[PDB]
C-alpha cells in the first residue's frame, strides 16, 4: 500500500499504484472490481497538468515526451508531423488526485535532471 490513489481511466473505476523500485518506475492501474488493468511507465511522461480545485470535475492529465529525433518543426513556423502523448485520469478527490500529481512531479524532476 505504498504510493497509490483512486484513479479512473477510460471511465473505469480503479486504483493506481506507483512503483519507484526501478529507475523509470512504473504506474499500474487495476479496476476497482477486478477485470481490467493497465500499466504505463511514468518515466515516459514529460510534463504534468491537471484541472483546478475550483473545477467541479476533478481530473489529472499527463503529457509524454516529444520525439525530437525524427520529427521536424521547420525553421520558422513549426512543421510538426506527429503529436505528443497526453493521457488523463478521472479522480474522485482533490487530496488523492493531488498526491499523484505531486509525486509525478518528483519522479520526472528527479529523472529529468539526473539524466
Amino acid at each position: 500500500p505504498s504510493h497509490s490513489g483512486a484513479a479512473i481511466f477510460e471511465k473505469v473505476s480503479g486504483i493506481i499504484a506507483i512503483n519507484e523500485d526501478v529507475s523509470p518506475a512504473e504506474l499500474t492501474w487495476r479496476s476497482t472490481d477486478g477485470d481490467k488493468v493497465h500499466t504505463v511507465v511514468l518515466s515516459t511522461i514529460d510534463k504534468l497538468q491537471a484541472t483546478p480545485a475550483s473545477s467541479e470535475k476533478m481530473m489529472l492529465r499527463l503529457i509524454g515526451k516529444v520525439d525530437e529525433s525524427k520529427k521536424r518543426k521547420d525553421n520558422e513556423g513549426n512543421e510538426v508531423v506527429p503529436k505528443p502523448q497526453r493521457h488523463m485520469f478521472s479522480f474522485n478527490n482533490r487530496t488523492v488526485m493531488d498526491n499523484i500529481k505531486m509525486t509525478l512531479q518528483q519522479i520526472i524532476s528527479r529523472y529529468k535532471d539526473a539524466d
Binding site: 497538468q49 473545477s55 470535475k57 481530473m59 497526453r86 488523463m88
Partner: peptide
C-alpha cells in the same frame, strides 16, 4: 461534442 473541450479543461486552468 465534448472531445475537443476535454483538452481545454486540462490544457488551461
Amino acid at each position: 461534442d465534448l472531445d475537443e473541450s476535454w483538452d481545454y479543461i486540462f490544457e488551461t486552468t
